[PDB]
């Protein structure tokens with residue numbers, strides 16, 4: 001049976017962790033996968049997290065199965081994060097949430113649900129976006145069509161080109177929106193532009209799918225849900241796939257959520273019974289530990305106050321790092337002006353380097369970025385900033 | 397979009413946990429989902445597990461992503477469990493393992509791999525078996541065909557009928573074997589019968605798929621892998637989907653493994669690059685916590701000696717419970733003789749009750765079994781044994 005199988009090409013992102021483990025030369029720099037590093041280049045488990053784990057260690061008496069959609073505190077806490085505490089979607093019981101293994105698991109259970117219970121056959125993704133968007137939706141059988149987004153030559157959101165690309169989206173198909181910190185560009189629609197995409201989406205009959213992995217990294221929890229909340233004021237059905245991998249530093253515990261919204265409880269419930277049947281045939285029920293950590297920090301104001309400050313320390317150090325990177329590049333004499341980096345959001349910057357510039361940065365300098373020129377600003381530290389900028393200036 | 401969606405029927409097993417939470421009357425008995433209970437009717441987190449968690453709490457410095465196939469200690473430890481420490485499959489580097497969320501996740505990543513990288517279009521499952529076998533393989537696009545297995549009228553393995561059913565399986569398709577403690581019958585092939593199914597499978601070109609969730613519950617770790625090991629002496633390719641949910645009491649942490657075997661490393665590696673591409677498009681990479689617990693107990697002889705005795709205390713209490721159930725049923729005057737229960741393996745017994753007998757046991761007596769008459773013997777305790785047998789005698 002297996003004689004004739006080909007070798008999958010490597011993942012543009014996770015495969016990059018592979019020559020970084022395989023390269024010797026201690027000056028190695030890793031600007032690849034989006035994982036936060038502190039000033040000492042480490043990705044610490046958060047204090048609020050270590051405390052929540054302490055509590056669970058002493059206070060847990062069973063590891064008996066959780067039930068398809070996971071722990072209920074978790075769902076009500078993520079709905080209040082995404083929607084706001086006093087929301088009409090929450091009071092009208094219009095939203096149901098299934099705890100999933102990470103945001104990727106949530107995009108896949110949404111993809112499998114859609115493919116099997118709906119008439120959807122096309123998902124629209126931005127050009128560019130996270131490469132795994134394409135594989136998840138194609139795994140479920142959906143075809144992925146692309147919309148314009150980034151104005152490269154000018155480093156902005158090409159709102160015209162976005163709208164006009166989208167004029168080809170049919171009533172009834174899915175458009176994927178990034179909640180905040182668009183991956184890979186760091187450019188997000190302003191609130192006026194989000195309510196324009198909100199108005200146009202109910203007019204055209206697109207079903208909105210939000211990928212919301214970075215809540216907290218652009219401006220703050222409340223401010224980052226603004227585009228999604230504008231969308232949930234105008235739509236009767238939406239799906240949001242969110243993750244707590246980055247804002248709780250819980251990367252490897254696989255903690256996310258798939259929230260289904262429908263017009264009333266009876267419908268969302270009937271729709272969610274199907275979403276649960278899709279989870280049962282995939283992984284059965286979700287991993288308890290990372291989601292219990294989130295539930296216990298979010299259910300306790302002392303732990304939530306500490307967590308909430310660790311998240312704004314993360315956001316601010318990253319913002320310090322992209323201030324420093326532009327300045328150091330200018331002090332290392334760059335032909336190009338990189339002022340635009342400072343306008344982008346979250347942990348990455350779309351540098352503008354060509355594929356051959358990032359190939360030789362790796363080969364010649366041990367500097368690891370993703371082939372699209374996406375650079376992880378959250379992995380830059382005051383110490384590696386001078387070798388890194390010097391590698392970049394020598395390649396421009 | 398969601399207006400026209402139907403409501404999935406309830407899961408024959410997990411749905412049962414729902415009227416148990418919804419029924420009042422304190423005499424409720426739950427013989428539904430296969431979850432071990434101790435003499436006090438609780439499903440404790442194991443001591444070796446609480447200790448491993450202690451170690452992890454103090455000794456872990458990051459929650460940074462694990463990488464598609466999960467933690468490497470875990471894979472080498474499960475290969476040595478499944479195959480034996482001095483195995484030729486291990487020394488020849490013929491086997492690769494991806495850590496998955498539970499055994500269900502491992503059956504699904506094997507199903508998705510097969511569907512997408514192989515010419516397989518049919519999977520053969522026993523009649524009867526675990527109902528979710530059918531949904532997992534149909535989710536990936538495979539069709540499920542069934543083979544005879546249980547001789548109901550006599551309570552044995554119908555080996556003839558099994559062979560003759562299987563004579564319709566084509567060269568190149570998948571036959572699903574339960575490693576030990578067949579779910580739902582508790583009847584397993586003896587070693588002579590396993591090597592007969594081993595000889596016939598290489599002769600007919602079936603690819604063997606082993607579902608191995610209960611290693612340790614029939615006779616012991618080593619003795620329970622005997623059928624699988626006989627199969628890995630004769631086959632060049634095999635897939636085993638195993639779980640640590642029950643033998644480590646780690647149910648809700650979603651800990652399992654999908655082990656791919658091929659004829660040589662270069663091939664198994666080329667095949668596994670594809671299995672990893674399927675995981676990436678599903679959940680990205682696995683939940684660390686439950687699999688780190690397993691790795692640290694299995695990597696340390698003090699923790700492994702303690703764990704290993706907690707597992708044989710589980711197995712033995714269950715064996716005490718099915719001794720007690722037959723006896724008490726006979727002391728409560730059953731028309732039928734239930735001596736056959738004592739011959740079955742693992743945590744369940746295929747009672748022989750009709751669907752209407754288990755419906756009224758629930759309705760009239762608050763006694764919860766699965767609709768096939770599958771009863772969880774591991775949930776029977778010295779205290780609930782007399783109400784339970786009296787409910788059963790009043791229904792025969």
Ligand SMILES: Cc1ncc(COP(=O)(O)O)c(CN[C@@](C)(CC(=O)O)C(=O)O)c1O
Pocket residue numbers: 013014032033034035101102103104105130132178183211213243244245251255256679680
């Ligand atoms: C846009 C987006 N959505 C989801 C995820 C994955 O979240 P998870 O499953 O909860 O871990 C990501 C993650 N992107 C990373 C950080 C890592 C990856 O490739 O999975 C990246 O861009 O390097 C994003 O970005």
Ligand SMILES: Cc1ncc(COP(=O)(O)O)c(CN[C@@](C)(CC(=O)O)C(=O)O)c1O
Pocket residue numbers: 283284409410428429430431497498499500501526528574579607609639640641647651652
């Ligand atoms: C035969 C078999 N294979 C896999 C699993 C699930 O293992 P997991 O994903 O690691 O939890 C099971 C589990 N069967 C249970 C105990 C629960 C269930 O329906 O998932 C049952 O029979 O009640 C089995 O049996």
